[PDB]
Write a protein that binds this ligand. Sequence first.
Ligand code: HEM
Ligand code: HEM
Ligand code: HEM
Lengths: 294, 294, 108
Amino acid sequence: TTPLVHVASVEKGRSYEDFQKVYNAIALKLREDDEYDNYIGYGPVLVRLAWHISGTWDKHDNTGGSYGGTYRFKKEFNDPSNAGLQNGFKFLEPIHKEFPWISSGDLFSLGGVTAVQEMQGPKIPWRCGRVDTPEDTTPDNGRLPDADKDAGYVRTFFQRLNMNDREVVALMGAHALGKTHLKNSGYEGPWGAANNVFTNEFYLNLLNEDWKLEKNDANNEQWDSKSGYMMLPTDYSLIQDPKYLSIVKEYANDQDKFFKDFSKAFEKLLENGITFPKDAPSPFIFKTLEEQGL
Amino acid sequence: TTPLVHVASVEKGRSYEDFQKVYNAIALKLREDDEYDNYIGYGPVLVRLAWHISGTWDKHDNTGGSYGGTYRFKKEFNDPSNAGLQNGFKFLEPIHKEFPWISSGDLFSLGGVTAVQEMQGPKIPWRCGRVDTPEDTTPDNGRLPDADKDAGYVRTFFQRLNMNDREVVALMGAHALGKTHLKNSGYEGPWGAANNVFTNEFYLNLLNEDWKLEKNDANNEQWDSKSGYMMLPTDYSLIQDPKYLSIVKEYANDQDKFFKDFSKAFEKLLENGITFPKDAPSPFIFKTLEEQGL
Amino acid sequence: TEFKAGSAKKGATLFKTRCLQCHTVEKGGPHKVGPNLHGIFGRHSGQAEGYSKTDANIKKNVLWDENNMSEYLTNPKKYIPGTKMAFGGLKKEKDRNDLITYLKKASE
Ligand code: HEM
Ligand code: HEM
Ligand code: HEM
């Protein structure tokens, strides 16, 4: 037999130079559309978008993931878990018009890689070849994680994504970016002060801020600090669990280790479910706008 | 400086008749302790105990295995993977008092052979001579396999036990016995209907039930049927892999061949790591209680 | 009548733990691993209202009474050669009177 296999197929006649141009298109628009969400910018929502299209993967039957680009379809687009991500889809729509040859999954995942790098995060190797799949391939709602949970839920959820403790804690450091919006998720507030620069501030705030459980205006409980930051129940679980806590202290102490571990976990997340052929090109590492004098 | 060799030494002045009495004592208690686990009995947990004491073996450095009886020590007794086996230990604990001369490894392995035979499985030749080793020989946790894995994990894990595809699929037929318990493993439910009688129904259920990947109350995913059976992901991988699927069909069609293959693989499992001397007795085949008039 | 009678309360407990996996009792109940057991004390076992038995069941033609049923439940893989019922057997005599008492009423 053979369960469903998603074989990567490079876009016809496209090479590294072509994707660097798409990276540049996204990266320049991130610079010019800097008013979004009280001058946070589109950086954080593009990272969340790339994670939400990848986070639907199920290792047990190989369904979901970023390969098929199915977030463009109604069922996934209107998932309650994806509330707010419409701003990321509309951000990428004109870029897709400029480069109509790129697949939906490639552009979504490339948006997240561009955003992390352009927010001064680590370099993320990126592989092309995702192929848009029919609408029936869209995973049903409910594969994405609920915030209102503890550490055991987080650990068991990410096993479905073939992620271990170190990969989980590292991927969760992306909450240094952006904020929660009450209208989107039922939670309100930023995780930190530098929420459009990729740093290890998430782990520092977890460990250095006094947190108090409090109900928000949506009747959800969240951890709040006097300085105005917040943590989701699933974030705060990373310091309630002893094996998670040791990794939080590791990344709080060494940002470079966090950078290396996040780059591997994030690329793995973006590539879950994709079978790459034997003759597939090596991952691309795109130059930033700054490295190009822009 | 030395090589790792576990040499079997027969219990002083003990022969077939001595071990048949131990078999008989285990088998009588299996008959009369009928209420355990909602009338399943202690049969399945004893089989799982025998496999978990043997499944720690590593062929690369000849550590682990049934030889040392190290499951009696704190580190192995508390392995999260052995949750629930304490009931099997408490079961054999009075039998060890009745026969204090038998080693721990011999008793743990004989209990699995007794359970299989008394649940109407094949006769399983059994060898004595395992010797209790000190506490510093207890293998660290982490050597037993995870259920949330695919066929490639199953194949590579059992390579460490020197088991090939035929022996793997045969050994997995033991999941016709007993059930998963949510409090032990994060999975709940049996594999079939006759869960204290040794049959090939594990393979029949794998092939003939309508399986659906579903969450359980422990946030883990498992395959469930409308009949109320379940399959672990590692179980279901046997029909996802084409080489495994070929063997599953063979056993679903011919229970006699399955019984013969299981007997060889199970004895091989209980003897991994043991060097039997040249003056070692031939393997014992014990009579069941029914064959003795009970 | 030499067959001892027991309590249907524990008989109901035994059926739901050792029989319900494969048998139902209710009128119109579906067949499972084993055939439906409504009216088992009316005629012989095999055939039933449908279901496909093996070649050993239908040929013996035993009208289930209250003791030969008790005998079959002790070691099924003995009374007939080629049955599909994989049952360990009710060994405890106090388990075998409670269940038949519950079975002679649930099957009407
Ligand atoms: C448990 C206590 C139990 C009882 C009681 C029971 C009853 C029973 C009867 C009376 C028959 C004969 C039916 C007939 O003549 O048509 C019968 C036969 C089968 N059974 Fe049974 N059974 C009990 C337990 C179980 C269990 C646990 C299973 C399966 C796991 C099972 C299955 C079967 C099957 C199959 C048959 C058909 C026999 C054949 O076709 O040869 N039973 N049972
Ligand atoms: C248990 C795991 C996770 C949970 C429960 C979770 C939950 C949430 C929630 C509730 C929000 C608020 C959205 C809003 O109100 O607008 C959010 C935002 C965000 N998430 Fe997470 N998330 C998880 C893991 C991740 C991972 C692995 C990543 C990236 C690798 C990520 C990236 C982001 C980003 C960047 C934002 C900010 C979005 C914005 O500001 O627009 N999250 N997440
Ligand atoms: C990849 C291989 C295997 C995996 C992942 C696995 C996993 C499991 C799990 C998770 C349970 C649940 C225990 C509980 O919740 O109580 C279980 C039970 C059991 N296992 Fe396996 N197992 C494997 C191989 C084997 C083998 C090789 C045997 C015997 C030869 C075996 C025999 C049993 C039995 C009999 C039970 C029932 C225990 C009971 O009911 O008390 N398993 N196994």
